[PDB]
Amino acid sequence: YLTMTQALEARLGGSPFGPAGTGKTESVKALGHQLGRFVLVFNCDETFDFQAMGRIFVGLCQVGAWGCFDEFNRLEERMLSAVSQQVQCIQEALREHSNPNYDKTSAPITCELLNKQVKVSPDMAIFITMNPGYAGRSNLPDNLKKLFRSLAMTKPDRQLIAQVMLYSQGFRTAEVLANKIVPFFKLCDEQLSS
Amino acid sequence: IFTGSADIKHLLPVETQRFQSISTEFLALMKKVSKSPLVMDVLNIQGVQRSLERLADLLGKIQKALGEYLERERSSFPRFYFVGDEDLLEIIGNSKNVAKLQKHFKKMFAGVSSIILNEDNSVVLGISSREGEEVMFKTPVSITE
Amino acid sequence: TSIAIGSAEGFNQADKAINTAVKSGRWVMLKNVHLAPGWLMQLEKKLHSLQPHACFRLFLTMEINPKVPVNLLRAGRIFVFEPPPGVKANMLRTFSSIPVSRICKSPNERARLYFLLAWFHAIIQERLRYAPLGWSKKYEFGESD
Amino acid sequence: FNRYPLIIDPSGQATEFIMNEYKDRKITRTSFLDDAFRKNLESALRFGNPLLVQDVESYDPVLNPVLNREVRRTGGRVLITLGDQDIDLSPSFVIFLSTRDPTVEFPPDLCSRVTFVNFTVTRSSLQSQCLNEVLKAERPDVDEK
Amino acid sequence: YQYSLQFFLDIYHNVLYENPNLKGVTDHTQRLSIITKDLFQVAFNRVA
Amino acid sequence: SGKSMAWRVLLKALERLEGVEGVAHIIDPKAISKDHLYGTLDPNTREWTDGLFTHVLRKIIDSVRGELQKRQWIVFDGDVDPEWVENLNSVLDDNKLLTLPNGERLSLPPNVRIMFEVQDLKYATLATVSRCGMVWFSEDVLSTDMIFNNFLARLRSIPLDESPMLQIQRDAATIMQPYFTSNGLVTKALEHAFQLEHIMDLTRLRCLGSLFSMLHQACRNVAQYNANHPDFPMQIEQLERYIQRYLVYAILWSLSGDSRLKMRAELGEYIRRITTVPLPTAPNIPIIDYEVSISGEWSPWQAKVPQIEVETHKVAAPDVVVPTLDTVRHEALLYTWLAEHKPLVLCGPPGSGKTMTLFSALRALPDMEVVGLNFSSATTPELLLKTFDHYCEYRRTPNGVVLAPVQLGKWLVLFCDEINLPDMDKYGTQRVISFIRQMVEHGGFYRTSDQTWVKLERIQFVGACNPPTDPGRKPLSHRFLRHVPVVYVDYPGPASLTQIYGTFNRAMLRLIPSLRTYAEPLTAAMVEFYTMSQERFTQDTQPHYIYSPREMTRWVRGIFEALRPLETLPVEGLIRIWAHEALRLFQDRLVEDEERRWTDENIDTVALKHFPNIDREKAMSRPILYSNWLSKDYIPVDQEELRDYVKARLKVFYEEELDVPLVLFNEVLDHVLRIDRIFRQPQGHLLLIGVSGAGKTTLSRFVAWMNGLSVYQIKVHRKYTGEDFDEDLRTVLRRSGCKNEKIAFIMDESNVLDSGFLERMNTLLANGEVPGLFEGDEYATLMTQCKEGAQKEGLMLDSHEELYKWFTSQVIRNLHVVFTMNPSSEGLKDRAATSPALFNRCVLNWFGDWSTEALYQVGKEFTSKMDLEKPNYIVPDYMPVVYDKLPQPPSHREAIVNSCVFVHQTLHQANARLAKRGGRTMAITPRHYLDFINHYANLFHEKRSELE
Amino acid sequence: SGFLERMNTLLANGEVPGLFEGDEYATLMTQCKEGAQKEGLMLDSHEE
Ligand SMILES: Nc1ncnc2c1ncn2[C@@H]1O[C@H](COP(=O)(O)OP(=O)(O)OP(=O)(O)O)[C@@H](O)[C@H]1O
Ligand SMILES: Nc1ncnc2c1ncn2[C@@H]1O[C@H](COP(=O)(O)OP(=O)(O)O)[C@@H](O)[C@H]1O
Ligand SMILES: Nc1ncnc2c1ncn2[C@@H]1O[C@H](COP(=O)(O)OP(=O)(O)O)[C@@H](O)[C@H]1O
Ligand SMILES: Nc1ncnc2c1ncn2[C@@H]1O[C@H](COP(=O)(O)OP(=O)(O)O)[C@@H](O)[C@H]1O
Ligand SMILES: [Mg+2]
Numbered sequence A: 001y002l003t004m005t006q007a008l009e010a011r012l013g014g015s016p017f018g019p020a021g022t023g024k025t026e027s028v029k030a031l032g033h034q035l036g037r038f039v040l041v042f043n044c045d046e047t048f049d050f051q052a053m054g055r056i057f058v059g060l061c062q063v064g065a066w067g068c069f070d071e072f073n074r075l076e077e078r079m080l081s082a083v084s085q086q087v088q089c090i091q092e093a094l095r096e097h098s099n100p101n102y103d104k105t106s107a108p109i110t111c112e113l114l115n116k117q118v119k120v121s122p123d124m125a126i127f128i129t130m131n132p133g134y135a136g137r138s139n140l141p142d143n144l145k146k147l148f149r150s151l152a153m154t155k156p157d158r159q160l161i162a163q164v165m166l167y168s169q170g171f172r173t174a175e176v177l178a179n180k181i182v183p184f185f186k187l188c189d190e191q192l193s194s
Numbered sequence B: 001i002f003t004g005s006a007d008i009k010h011l012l013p014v015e016t017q018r019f020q021s022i023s024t025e026f027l028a029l030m031k032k033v034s035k036s037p038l039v040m041d042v043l044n045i046q047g048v049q050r051s052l053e054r055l056a057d058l059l060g061k062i063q064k065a066l067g068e069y070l071e072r073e074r075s076s077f078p079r080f081y082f083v084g085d086e087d088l089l090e091i092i093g094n095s096k097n098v099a100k101l102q103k104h105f106k107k108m109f110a111g112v113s114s115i116i117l118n119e120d121n122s123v124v125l126g127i128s129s130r131e132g133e134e135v136m137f138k139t140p141v142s143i144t145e
Numbered sequence C: 001t002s003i004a005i006g007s008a009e010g011f012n013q014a015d016k017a018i019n020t021a022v023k024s025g026r027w028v029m030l031k032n033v034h035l036a037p038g039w040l041m042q043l044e045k046k047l048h049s050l051q052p053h054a055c056f057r058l059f060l061t062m063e064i065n066p067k068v069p070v071n072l073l074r075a076g077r078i079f080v081f082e083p084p085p086g087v088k089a090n091m092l093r094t095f096s097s098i099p100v101s102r103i104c105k106s107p108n109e110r111a112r113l114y115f116l117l118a119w120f121h122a123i124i125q126e127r128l129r130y131a132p133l134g135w136s137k138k139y140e141f142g143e144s145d
Numbered sequence D: 001f002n003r004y005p006l007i008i009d010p011s012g013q014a015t016e017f018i019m020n021e022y023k024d025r026k027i028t029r030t031s032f033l034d035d036a037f038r039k040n041l042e043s044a045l046r047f048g049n050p051l052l053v054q055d056v057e058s059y060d061p062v063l064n065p066v067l068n069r070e071v072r073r074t075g076g077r078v079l080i081t082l083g084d085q086d087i088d089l090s091p092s093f094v095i096f097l098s099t100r101d102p103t104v105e106f107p108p109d110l111c112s113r114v115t116f117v118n119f120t121v122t123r124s125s126l127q128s129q130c131l132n133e134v135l136k137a138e139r140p141d142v143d144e145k
Numbered sequence E: 001y002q003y004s005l006q007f008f009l010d011i012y013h014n015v016l017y018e019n020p021n022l023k024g025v026t027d028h029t030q031r032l033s034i035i036t037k038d039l040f041q042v043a044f045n046r047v048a
Numbered sequence F: 001s002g003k004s005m006a007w008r009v010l011l012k013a014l015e016r017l018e019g020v021e022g023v024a025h026i027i028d029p030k031a032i033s034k035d036h037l038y039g040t041l042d043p044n045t046r047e048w049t050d051g052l053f054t055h056v057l058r059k060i061i062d063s064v065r066g067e068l069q070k071r072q073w074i075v076f077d078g079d080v081d082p083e084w085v086e087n088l089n090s091v092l093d094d095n096k097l098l099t100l101p102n103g104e105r106l107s108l109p110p111n112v113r114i115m116f117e118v119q120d121l122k123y124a125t126l127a128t129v130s131r132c133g134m135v136w137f138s139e140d141v142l143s144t145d146m147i148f149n150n151f152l153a154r155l156r157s158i159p160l161d162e163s164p165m166l167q168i169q170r171d172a173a174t175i176m177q178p179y180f181t182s183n184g185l186v187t188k189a190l191e192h193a194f195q196l197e198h199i200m201d202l203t204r205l206r207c208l209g210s211l212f213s214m215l216h217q218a219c220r221n222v223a224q225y226n227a228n229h230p231d232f233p234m235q236i237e238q239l240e241r242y243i244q245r246y247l248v249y250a251i252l253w254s255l256s257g258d259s260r261l262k263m264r265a266e267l268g269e270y271i272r273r274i275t276t277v278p279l280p281t282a283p284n285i286p287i288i289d290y291e292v293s294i295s296g297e298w299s300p301w302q303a304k305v306p307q308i309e310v311e312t313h314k315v316a317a318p319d320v321v322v323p324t325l326d327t328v329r330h331e332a333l334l335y336t337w338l339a340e341h342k343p344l345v346l347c348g349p350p351g352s353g354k355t356m357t358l359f360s361a362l363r364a365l366p367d368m369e370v371v372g373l374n375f376s377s378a379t380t381p382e383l384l385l386k387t388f389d390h391y392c393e394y395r396r397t398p399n400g401v402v403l404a405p406v407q408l409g410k411w412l413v414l415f416c417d418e419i420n421l422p423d424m425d426k427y428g429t430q431r432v433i434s435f436i437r438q439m440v441e442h443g444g445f446y447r448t449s450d451q452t453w454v455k456l457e458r459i460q461f462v463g464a465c466n467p468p469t470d471p472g473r474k475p476l477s478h479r480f481l482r483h484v485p486v487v488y489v490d491y492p493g494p495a496s497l498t499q500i501y502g503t504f505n506r507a508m509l510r511l512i513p514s515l516r517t518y519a520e521p522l523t524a525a526m527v528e529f530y531t532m533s534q535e536r537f538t539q540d541t542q543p544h545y546i547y548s549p550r551e552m553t554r555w556v557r558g559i560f561e562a563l564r565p566l567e568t569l570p571v572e573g574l575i576r577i578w579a580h581e582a583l584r585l586f587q588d589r590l591v592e593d594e595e596r597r598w599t600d601e602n603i604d605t606v607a608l609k610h611f612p613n614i615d616r617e618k619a620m621s622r623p624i625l626y627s628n629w630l631s632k633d634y635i636p637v638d639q640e641e642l643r644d645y646v647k648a649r650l651k652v653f654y655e656e657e658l659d660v661p662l663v664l665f666n667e668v669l670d671h672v673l674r675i676d677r678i679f680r681q682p683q684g685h686l687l688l689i690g691v692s693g694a695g696k697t698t699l700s701r702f703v704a705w706m707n708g709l710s711v712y713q714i715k716v717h718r719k720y721t722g723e724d725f726d727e728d729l730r731t732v733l734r735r736s737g738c739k740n741e742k743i744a745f746i747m748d749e750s751n752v753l754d755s756g757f758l759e760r761m762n763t764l765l766a767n768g769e770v771p772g773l774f775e776g777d778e779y780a781t782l783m784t785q786c787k788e789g790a791q792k793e794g795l796m797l798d799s800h801e802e803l804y805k806w807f808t809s810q811v812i813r814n815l816h817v818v819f820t821m822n823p824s825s826e827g828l829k830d831r832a833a834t835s836p837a838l839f840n841r842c843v844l845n846w847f848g849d850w851s852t853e854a855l856y857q858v859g860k861e862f863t864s865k866m867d868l869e870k871p872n873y874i875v876p877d878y879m880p881v882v883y884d885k886l887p888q889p890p891s892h893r894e895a896i897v898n899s900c901v902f903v904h905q906t907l908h909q910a911n912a913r914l915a916k917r918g919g920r921t922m923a924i925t926p927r928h929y930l931d932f933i934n935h936y937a938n939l940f941h942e943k944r945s946e947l948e
Numbered sequence G: 001s002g003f004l005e006r007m008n009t010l011l012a013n014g015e016v017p018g019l020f021e022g023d024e025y026a027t028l029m030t031q032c033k034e035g036a037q038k039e040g041l042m043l044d045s046h047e048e
């Protein structure tokens, strides 16, 4: 929450990265739901090209919705470079909202998406979740990476999640159960065959 | 769509005329069904199988020719950008049949699965979630006005 | 005019930007050109038969990649950007990149904070040279940080 | 030369030398990448004019019969088959292929059809060039003499 | 590390015509030493 | 492991338990492209087309026909790789959303389950594994007793005819029952079979699937016997006596038919120890050498192998099969599987008789049409789909779309000759193999145009392949093998070869009655040299060093063609033809001079070993040349007489076709004769390999002009694309298929601008037809031209299918393809997978580079005009000789030409030195040498004229 | 005289009923479908 909100204040994107099953996507949605935002998840692949991403940005910008692009490094490297231009122009538009000199009773903030002037709502945001350890994935160009603030989400706090969930479900011995179930899963990953 | 938006006639004159020509043959076949609503009588209408096969193919062409018109309507309500072309045509074309709009709200909203309507279906009283939780608007939205 | 290269539209935009710039002295920067090695060869041939405005400059941004054509490399002047050789060079690069008015604002203590940040940034980056001991991994501590 | 020459000159004096040597015979410069190359090649073959074609790294296999001299002499006519069109071959025709890339690799089929003429900088020639240039800068009276 | 002949000739031209160390020098021998010294310096600066 | 039956039974059980109708959509994700699985966004119109999975899920969400009230299971039965399944990450997690690049998001309804039936997950990532519930099936979950019960239960309830047939099955089931118990004969045999070596990986269902198919045929045999004997149907005592022996017979072929003879034998003794079924009592004859007669008696297979005499005009003809022990056994086994419409694969070394055995078995099985498909490394399911478009029709039925052959009452057999060549992706999947597995396991496939399931009817598959250990060959998936019985067809042994081609030689030596006695030594020499060559040269040295009985068939045919127009011939004349054909078949493909020297020497050794008391010189004179250019017949020709004739014809060739003068050296005369032979054979295709500028194209055009063949070359350019090649292919096929025009289609490796070019040629070289080349209006125009063309031949052909067969037969006899390529060790080995037809349908002639002898002859011939006579020249004591046959007292002209040869060879040394230092080198070609001597003549005349 | 019987129909109706037959008509329909597409006309029927 601290890292992503720092990126939002800096009008930058959030880039949680780590192995699978660490809460990267759910945390982005949780932060968006915390702020009362419409969070849209996209399962990216190599077919998310420059034209497809731009149209998605057009919808996100006008609605004011958050775009969480998961597996964002499954795009082709050439498409990642091209998309960086669209991400940058939106971010410059977002900083126009943050300007104190700008007054709400003026011409709406607008960025150029797909050679069209598109109004940008201040509530919209861009998030990308990626597993940088997956071989065969596309490397993000540096000019794209500077547009995102990255946070490593590698070790989820399993015992706390287990304790709170069991306590919220009504288990009286949630602390005892959590102290057993979480080590038990750790033991299974090592004691059992591979 | 081809009745409630006079702008589309100028935007796509070919499509409009094509649809009207087909819309005529559809209505003519509808009138025959009205005279003889018995299934066997309808089944014995000459070439009725081939008539529907042509109607299905022809109506599909019109549908695929409204893409640029749909991109224009998506600007007027940007949450339409997250709706497919066919579903958007159902939304636009069924603007009077509100009950058919219910299945599409989950695509345009985070947690709005359906809207609450009065007995007339002319005023939107509120919104509801997929779990049944309802939000009642303080000032209801009138569809007639 | 800054253009990313990967898109098909980027190639068209690059040609128009270059053609406009060579007649007006405008500057054009093309980023990540190593992603289009084939198009880079055609750009080298285009630049050869051209006498642009005296103020025109073309900047090509690429990673150090063997895919970059030799003919393009010979035609241009190469500048390598890499981690500064040491702590002294790292901190001198930092103080040149940050405008003087940025450091010299009303709080006089701001200057010492920037120095501490410059020293901290130099130490952290220089430890990457010791791949394993300085840091367990080769983190990309950089200008954005 | 017996086989037509392929010229390798990164500096480009060979291209100039070929054009200086063949002004009186109206030599035309073109490239394999130009849109008029087929028209220029057809015109040079028909009228027997010298042709200089650049960017041989993009060699067009349409020259394969021309380089192999596959001519058909029937009916008092000397014919060369360029694509699907037969062209009368004038005996004064000559073609020079050129590239500015010394590192380009040619396939063995092209290597058998051309005479390689490589313009590489020699130590003696560069010494003469630099001795003359400093003489021009430092002793203009001596250099002129 | 790809370098054309024109790149070196640009370096050589710079040492001969755009050299601040030859502004007031008139002796041919001393100019030659300056040119020889500066040729190595500009060659390293631009290539490196 | 019972995975499919586990969810198919559960789906039906939940329908009965809960009252909710269960619907399963089974998808093979890797049998189609990922574009066809999820959909595509149009690059220009930006229109979205649904893929297979997207269409199915969208149909359920829309719920036009009440799909939301039913249990909907989408089963991805196939391989899992991260490329396609990671599109389902948002589907399989709590999002339950399929996100599309057009911005659309499809919610998974609660009644939908996404299921993945797979054999392994060795390429799935953690992202996918963590998002899905796992049920692990082991091979112990499905016991062999359970499979035996299923086969027996079906045998006792489902009639095979479409009950007297069921009564036979029920009585036969009682007989088989004791042997199908746990720890029975079949169980023990199966366990022992896994210990043996098989040409393909062995699985329990491949063996049992084969075993159950054979036993079903045995039940059909008893019914067919009752038809032959309406008076006395087979009694239980005879029925019992037949089934037990047939079961043993079926066990051996189902469990060892994919293994070599030694392994087939060893399973025989093991069965002999443990079985109680009566067995043949021969001392040293393997059980696999016996069949089971309908009277329940073991009968030796040798009783069905007569020593035939072949009609003299059918000697080594493609349709003629000499009966051997292996052929009659393999044909009977193929008959059983084919008659049951069971897909099968024949595996063996190239040329072992797989196509011959399959087509021989199909002749005894009417009402079945075979269509040959030739797989390459680039073969996709689309090759199968074009074959369906030409031979089959899609028809709308109340139960769905059915694909059936156009001809009624016929079962259409898709024969795939290289089924294990198609490229395996990085995730261990061959797309076409998954497509065939779908059509065999699920009885159909999905039509990607409308996302509609298509059911196959009267379509079966037969595969042929080389062993998976061979280069370019991949192991077949175990999920495909469980449905396909494999029979191993090995090379015939030395005694089998003697029986086959001894029969052919006896027939072919009836042309000359005075040569009848030499039939046995001629066969023995043929077998000895062929065996020696096959051992001496292997695929380890060069990728095209494959010697098979195909060379033996060509050897006998070649001698036979040279003997038909001959009234008489001495035995020395027979040896010369025998030696000549050996050189054409064994020496012309060799790369190295040592290899060619060995072949030349051992031809003489073998011939004199089997043919003593012959005049060696008149029969084995090293310049062995045969031609029909100086006479009506194909008789030996003198080298000097041939040289004069070629010069006379080259003079005319310059004035009519190509005015490019050529220097005639000895290798050219041999080369033009070799090219002339191929142009006079049906489907005569040439693979000319040599350095550029060596005259491969020019000689081909010159020989094509001598044989009346028109030369077609595709006119490539920088913008020449695949549909340009397709239109060019249509032009050549129309001329040779409709206008009866003999065409030499000469195409170089440089003409191959895309891998799709050779996928078309691979089909054209093998079958004389391209299934999808003529489509739409092109096919309609072709049919009009074929009807006109066949009319000019006096043929009453009107049917489109009849017309297309005649058009194919015309292309086979008229179209000649000449492929020219440079020698590249990596390229040549890779070339075999891309176009296997180039190496088994084309005659390969290694022209290579010009030799030292060729360089000297070109130099001496070209410098005749030169005035190089210096009578005062002194021969040095140490002469720098580079031509081995340079005369011992060389003259000044001889020294000059010798020096000219040396200069050319120095450039090869010069290139090697720069190449070894990493320097860039350019190819040295004979055109450099021709350039050299041309300049030498011009400068010499110019300098002599200036000085005088 | 048969030349003008064709032109008499062509001048008045812009069409010759029997000129395109067999494969010629099939090729014409393919070209007309391509030609009408370039004009932005959704015409598929042969009569259309
Ligand atoms: N419970 C059962 N009782 C009897 N026979 C069974 C049972 N389950 C499966 N079989 C039979 O054994 C074989 C198992 O095939 P099945 O499709 O169930 O296996 P699978 O592991 O899903 O196969 P694959 O991995 O090839 O997809 C079939 O011949 C089937 O008819
Ligand atoms: N803080 C958390 N509290 C509860 N559940 C969590 C938390 N973080 C992750 N999860 C759960 O872990 C699983 C994986 O979360 P997800 O965001 O999909 O991970 P990732 O994006 O790293 O693949 C989901 O079931 C999610 O709800
Ligand atoms: N018994 C036989 N009778 C006739 N020809 C045989 C026999 N055994 C082998 N051959 C020869 O072996 C070759 C096998 O060719 P083919 O069937 O195409 O082999 P494969 O399918 O294994 O590549 C042919 O030349 C064929 O004539
Ligand atoms: N035997 C020969 N004598 C003289 N010139 C030859 C001979 N063979 C080839 N050439 C020359 O080489 C050229 C290329 O011949 P071509 O058949 O295209 O070679 P390849 O097919 O081996 O690449 C010819 O046009 C001719 O000039
Ligand atoms: Mg995630």
Ligand SMILES: [Mg+2]
Binding pocket: F003, F004, F005, F077, F117
């Ligand atoms: Mg299964």
